[PDB]
Amino acid sequence: TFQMFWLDYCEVNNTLILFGKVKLKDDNCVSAMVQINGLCRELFFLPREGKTPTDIHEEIIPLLMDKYGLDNIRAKPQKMKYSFELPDIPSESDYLKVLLPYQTPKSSRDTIPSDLSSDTFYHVFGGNSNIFESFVIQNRIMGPCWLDIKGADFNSIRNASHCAVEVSVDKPQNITPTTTKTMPNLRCLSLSIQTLMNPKENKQEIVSITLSAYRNISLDSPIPENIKPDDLCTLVRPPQSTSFPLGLAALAKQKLPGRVRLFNNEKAMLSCFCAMLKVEDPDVIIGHRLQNVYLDVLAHRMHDLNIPTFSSIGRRLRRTWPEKFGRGNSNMNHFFISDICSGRLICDIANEMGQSLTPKCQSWDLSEMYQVTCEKEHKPLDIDYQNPQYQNDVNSMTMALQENITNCMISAEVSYRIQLLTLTKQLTNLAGNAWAQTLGGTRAGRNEYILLHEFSRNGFIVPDKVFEPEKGLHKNYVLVMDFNSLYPSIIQEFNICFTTVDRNKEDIDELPSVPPSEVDQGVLPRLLANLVDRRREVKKVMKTETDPHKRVQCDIRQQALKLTANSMYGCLGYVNSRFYAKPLAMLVTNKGREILMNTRQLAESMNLLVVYGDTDSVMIDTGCDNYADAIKIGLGFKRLVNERYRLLEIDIDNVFKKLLLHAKKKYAALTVNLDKNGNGTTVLEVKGLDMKRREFCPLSRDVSIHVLNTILSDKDPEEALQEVYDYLEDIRIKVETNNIRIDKYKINMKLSKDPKAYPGGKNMPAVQVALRMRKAGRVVKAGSVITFVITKLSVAERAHALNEVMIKSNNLIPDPQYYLEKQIFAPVERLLERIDSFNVVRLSEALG
Template sequence: MIDNFFILDFSYDVVENKPVIYIWAIDKEGNRVVLLEKKFRPYFYALVDDNYNIDEIRKEILKLSKPYSPITSINVEEKKYFGSPVRVLKIETVIPAYVRVYRDEVAKIKGVKSVLEADIRFYMRYSIDNNLKPFYWIEAEVEEIKENNFRVKKVYELKKINKLYEDKIPELKVLAFDIEVYNKYGSPNPRRDPVIIIGVWTKEGGKQFLADKYDDLRAIREFINFVQTYDPDIIVGYNINNFDWPYLLERANIRGIRLDVGRRVNGEPSQGVYGHYSITGRLNVDLYGFAQSIQEVKVKTLENIADYLGVLPKEKRTIVEWYDIPKYWDDEKKRDILLKYNLDDAKSAYLLGEVFIPFGIELTRISGLPLDQLSMASVGHRVEWLLMREAYKYNELIPNKEEREYESYEGGLVISPLPGIHEDVYVLDFSSMYPSIMIKYNIGPDTLVKGECENCWISPAGHKFRKDPPGLYKNVLEKLIQERKEVKKLMEKTMDEYDKRVLDARQRALKVMANAFYGYMGWLGARWYSKEGAEAVTAWGRQIISESAKIAKEKGFTVIYGDTDSIFVKGGGDINSLITEISSKFGLEIKIDKIYKRVFFTENKKRYAGLTEDGKIDIVGFEAVRGDWCDLAKQVQTNVIELILKSGKVEDAIKYVKTVIFDLRRYNFRIEDLIIWKTIDKNLDEYDVTAPHVVAAKKAAKAGYLVSKGVKIGYVIVKGSGKISDKAEPYFLIKEKNKIDVEYYIDKQIIPVAMRILEGFGVKESSLKTGGVDILSFFKK
């Protein structure tokens, strides 16, 4: 029979000594199904030296064949490797795990220069070779079979795939969850501390499974049953790969039950690549991975991200500190508060899923990386999976991963700012400058020419790249950019709001992927790494920005600032004429990105603040968007900037800072606003220095709290004698405001961040206590 299926995910298993690939899918009637592919076999390539007899090499490889997973075929193929034609042997076996065994042995045979594509996961190898991606439809010839070990409506054996196509995404069932642990003795320990609450949220609302006081067996069982019954396609949570899943797995094991939440019977979550947990037949999406891209939020807790994105503001939810959970659980009068807190966490995760998943789906459709892995994979890994798929189409061999030493190279051009306040400033931005340069000059490791070249582009850095034929990077980037243009045209035409949202997510994903190519090329972990390519891109970029600034000056504009792919100009004549001239000279699109009604610069590069025509304030490079200051200090600086930009009166800013200082001395503040967050970047016993955050971390550890490499420690400075480090205390151990050293916060936090702005207008520290300045004298005409 022929039917149509919407792909969710891939997995595989070895059944009766043969690999079986599972394609988890939804049919046109909305049934959850699985397709079994039983014919595909694992393989890898041996790149051979032309000076050796290829038939002799074949014979040597065949001698390695092992009974449990024999080498079933060795075929000679013509491929390309970094753009050059090569001969390879394609070596096929039976059991995927044996690819690595044979890889190491084949690499030792004389005449084998390299072994390639032996580190590609089996089911991803299958999806690449057959051009299959999650969230696309396939038309396939299948035969229904009877299998009892799957929690799906129907099981099919896949006979043939006729085509892959795009159509409307069926409604996907999403379940969010969050657990609370009874950790009365410091950091949670699954061998000791029970799971007391498991909260879930679906489109139907919330539900909770509670422990019998301290016995969590019933709660875990009810959660398992609910997942099986509700049967979600996607399970979401926040930091669930690092905490919830491993904790639940160990608790279930201790209680003697299986955490059987997958669509395959008796299947438990298992840890896979990028640290994510795989759940067979479902997509386990840790939203913490997506939240890492939100640079504006330094401390990325669930409540902070949900508050920033507006899905559940802090003032509309219940917050309980993790170290107070046992108190709320033990006190019957307070337990409802804890239950509300847990349900708010589950709801926050569900609502964040509505924000992140549509974008993630489009990234998956571009890269082919399943959504659960994509959420935790770096931008570089997302780009790499797209390149691996495209390389297969171009008959290009996929390079191996290599360990490389760090190599520095010159970055983009920054034109020194003109300090002071400026009005009516245009920000001219080159659209996707670096991808455009890579396309225009055919830059990539496969187009790099190190010797003589008659038909090459020569970069300002001296590197040569052949003009023809196009390299892998150029081919892929042109596809991404062209598709984005087509998607944006469709967005303009469509009237359907749902379709418009899908298309918008698509164009944003295409933009993100295209803009990531330059960074990927210079990433030491990249298979297609090219330091020369990265150097060439930035060299051409510097040239373009420098010459664009000259053109602007020749046309009567004042160049206020320039950074990598944009210039800030004011005055002059017709801005559209300037755009046209720059665009035509370099063959790159340049547009007005922003118009600042008022903007001010200090003497430092990459540090400015501006007020746009629509009233939005941009802050770049000041402490307000960095994390090594307390929240109150960041808020003070933000407010100082806002007052100056909007009112134009420095006296208002000085008066405001004075008020903050006055309130601190009256203890009119929240301790939470004075917390300073720093990351512990190595084990505590490895620290020789006594920095405040290290001292605070050691105090927290001594009090029984888990402090490990990579975590953020929050601390406050309290009264006392000695160095500042000696007065650093973990914030959760300080309850009384009168213990806070307010003079430290005034002298080392509030005044310094305010002065970073105000000193540019001639304000002295003493002016925060007396005096004022006329800001109008600092306007640049």
């Protein structure tokens, strides 16, 4: 027998590889891979009126043996239920289950179409089945867990992976899941990458890399705060020259923690990186903005510099990159990188998943995340290796390397503090998908698997793959109430399911009816009910639980259950979902409208005013100027709603001391965050305003921020607006005299298309700046971000690349007219558009 706790997988040559950890005689855990052969697609042939599974068996099997070239094909009758959107297919029938291996001698890449109409059957399910999905469903594997693996061949596989152990199995049935709740220790490696931009080719090159190793991260117990690394090492190449100044190593050992290794070029550094990575052999790679920034760069540099050992970024061994790698397809390239990493979990704290756990963040900049989550201060150093100081200034280089090290250590500590690993693991076990997927931030991922496992276990055949805002300033405390669990409660209350709702599968636009009380509880609602109950048990345990450790763990558990339940709707509601059902989505939505309407009435019944509302949340003005009084109002509203809808549990999600609402998802506000000792603190929060777009410069953002701060202040409104005009006048003077850093005038704009391919590009400053670069010699293709400054004739014509403008000798000063008008005036005119005693004349005069 062979025991492995599996973490990740990858598909290759119609086989399935699992990467995981194995315990050794000395209880030591090492990496391992298991190649799984003998996997088959389960196809289900639906007999025609008056036919049997044997009628099919005789017909197609001989035909299948020929095409695919098999001696014998396992097939058997099996009674299955069908309750999805395909018309004319019956609720229940006898099907012919055919086990068609993925690996065939002939035409292994030719799939059987679903419309295979014969005189025996008329339909076939499981034709395009994915290999990982097949393994996981058939063996009932629910996310990362311990697996008992029998008949493991230790002499078949050689040099297939970067793992310590390589084995294979002849059949998937050799692998069975265990009940063990515990898991082995993980090997985490925090990465921090410092880059440099070459303006010639528009290529972000790597200057340094920090590697911090934490070889024993146990998710079965809380991770100690400010955990110390087992090893710290930094690799660095010279950003300008071919050699570092002498004595650099002596100063590094003196001032910098961990090992420091200096290289003569980027290629040698990255080769060393790959080798160190292979030896370290981490289970998890932690970082900040790895997924869509630094990981892409790293891969592309390894590609560019022809690094042969690049594949150690994952756990699968490859001699060559994918053929279509670097075809300029920023979309497909991402897939290739994720695939190459297979075997190592990417723990990005600043990705879609990570952001969700740090809602109190606004920018999600590393320093910001560290402050918010750990309540510790770090002043970010802006390192620009193009600066000449770095070539000969050993202390400058040392300061930059220290900055990189700090950032690496910060990324790891944050990832542990927000408990990203534990939560995503829980979510994976609940949905039964791949951990890798969860850590990524997909929507059709944990919502499709959770359903395939529930329905497959219950013998079902699965499918093949608002209130106008009250615009203005709100002086009284506004509470954001979260109705995330609106839909799940609706699906559970009315018993909405694919199995319970009689609907017209010909006309999906036809509204169906809720099932009668007589109908038994459906599959979907039963699953929902189970999740809700489990969540209840956890909270009950929390009231009693005394251990801070066990307590926190319980909090994570319930969060996972909540997120899983609140993601069930997307399954049937979002159009490109595997389980999409328009009649069911509509049915749920209308009940959601009734519930919300009554909700509005309830708020008004409490003399409250709904400032804004939608299916996700409803913001209510409490009419109070006190945190306490506002909270009492909010709790009364929560209770009131639950009495009307006992399965609908809303809660207070966000407290706004003040709220300037501008549009549906466009507002600024002062959120109140309570501390440990009850202490309350105010913080600015912005969504959707001009101050959040790329097209507005840091100066414009700075003006917007200060203006808001003063307006949402408690000081009298005329003094506030007067302070605003007095601020703008001063800014105006500073702009005209050009006494503001040029960096603050920079404007970014992404070109999804090629610079040349733009109809009205002759008016677009970004496009013009891009084209001038090609003529100048600089490289610029689709997917490029253009940074420019408008100079002092046409606006687009006066636009120039920031870096060009940065050279003080070019005599390119920013155009005051433009920045005061389009970057300072307009945005403020919108921010204060609906504020009492606001006068556009005062503003324009304080400007021009």
